[PDB]
Amino acid sequence: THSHGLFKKLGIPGPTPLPFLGNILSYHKGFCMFDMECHKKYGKVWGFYDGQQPVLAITDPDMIKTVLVKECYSVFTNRRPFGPVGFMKSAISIAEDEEWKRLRSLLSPTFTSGKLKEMVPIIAQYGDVLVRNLRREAETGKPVTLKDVFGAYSMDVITSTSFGVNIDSLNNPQDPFVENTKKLDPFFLSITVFPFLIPILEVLNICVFPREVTNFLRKSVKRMKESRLEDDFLQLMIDSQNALSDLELVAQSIIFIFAGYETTSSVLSFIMYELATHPDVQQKLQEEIDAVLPNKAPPTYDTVLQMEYLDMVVNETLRLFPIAMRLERVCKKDVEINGMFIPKGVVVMIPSYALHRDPKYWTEPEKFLPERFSKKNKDNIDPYIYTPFGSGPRNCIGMRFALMNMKLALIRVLQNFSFKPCKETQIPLKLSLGGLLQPEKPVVLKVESR
Ligand code: HEM
Ligand SMILES: CC(C)c1nc(CN(C)C(=O)N[C@@H](C(=O)N[C@@H](C)CC[C@H](C)NC(=O)OCc2cncs2)C(C)C)cs1
Ligand SMILES: CC(C)c1nc(CN(C)C(=O)N[C@@H](C(=O)N[C@@H](C)CC[C@H](C)NC(=O)OCc2cncs2)C(C)C)cs1
Known part of the structure; x- marks a missing residue:
């Protein structure tokens, strides 16, 4: 608590903290509303408390570049x-x-x-x-849960690449693998307040994913390595095992497996939501795709970068839904950035979701307007306000892979399907409150052959 004086003594604005809890109860809105509201209420910079942890929000495009790029x-x-x-x-x-x-x-x-x-x-x-999977169940003609269908795609695509192991999650609606992956939670609430508990859980062997998912991979990523040793990612880590070690190899793998599954399917679900509620944009893209890849032609590396409107669509969706609500860097020594002292131990926080929706930098910012990304308007967009992949040396290592993967999936889907909203379809869309940015109710859309 003795710490609750920090932003008062530093002269920084903020919601005033309760003992022990900090500003935690403000997350009852959700980490995104809290941030939005804080921006509006305190202007450029403010402080709050994650239980006992001071977190300094920053919004200055300059100050942002300093902490993300220059002072990393x-x-x-x-x-x-x-x-x-x-x-x-x-x-x-x-x-x-x-x-x-x-x-x-x-x-x-x-x-x-x-x-x-x-x-x-x-x-x-x-x-x-x-x-194929889309077509078999467009016959149904009954709303389709995009996330499911996107998920299984996401799945097959990361395994098959980073490892070299085709796992066929698709001819297989039934799956030994995805189960382990995806698995009102008071657990992270109790830690995020009380971190003095954290070393206790470590000793007890209690981990944020059970000795079931990992004990799976421990031996499973052991599995994918061994058969290889007879006749990419999994590769380059074996370059280093002559200095990447046993579990060090397995831990990179899980980080990838997750990112490549969860993020890739959520964005692709959000985009299709957008395309369906903006049929015009859907059409324009379906034309560009048709203009670039004619005769239902298969997308390739170079043809993907050719596609300007597609890139506009991906970007605009990522403006509205930046699956990572914020970026964060822990300040490891005292510092004076752009005329602001910041004490050792403070967590500096860049509120990506909010800046993406800020009056100051976006006209009509609630509206899905892909054209704000055209060559004409492209250059009037600050790369420190728009941060869906973070920035600087600790930015998203998977950016390029993520974009191309999403696009490849987008292209083939559109070059043979149309998506319209139906009964269950939640319009407008409501984000869930929790950690990752999700739609509270699944994206269900009707799908038609072309
Ligand atoms: C559209 C989907 C994705 C979005 C929106 C996304 C967004 C991000 C963001 C905003 C960061 C933090 C940047 C920062 O803190 O400065 C990040 C970090 C990272 N991402 Fe991505 N990401 C996506 C997909 C991926 C993929 C496909 C991979 C790899 C397979 C990946 C692996 C990572 C790793 C390892 C980090 C931490 C990097 C480090 O600390 O060196 N994410 N992700
Ligand atoms: C307790 C039992 C019932 C279960 N709970 C869950 C919840 N769940 C779906 C889940 O996997 N979330 C877990 C979890 O680790 N969540 C937090 C800490 C994620 C951390 C943040 C959001 N980072 C993050 O993943 O950002 C996305 C990326 C961008 N680029 C690469 S990754 C946790 C609650 C087990 C599954 S099973
Ligand atoms: C705590 C209460 C409010 C609850 N929240 C939830 C939902 N939740 C925590 C959530 O969004 N989790 C999602 C999630 O992020 N997944 C977990 C598995 C990610 C865990 C990985 C290992 N996190 C991780 O370490 O990522 C690194 C980064 C951090 N920042 C940028 S990259 C899940 C649904 C896919 C259920 S109950």
């Missing part, structure tokens, strides 16, 4: 330590300082022109299977 290596290197993680301490996105840079540059040779282009023929094989 020296002072803003790490994210918040977030729960009981155990061996997942070694995962890239969870690692800190030295073990990070090592892991980061050991893995960033993975998503590069070369690699990407090499993943295309494999990923585009599961585009074809997405078309």
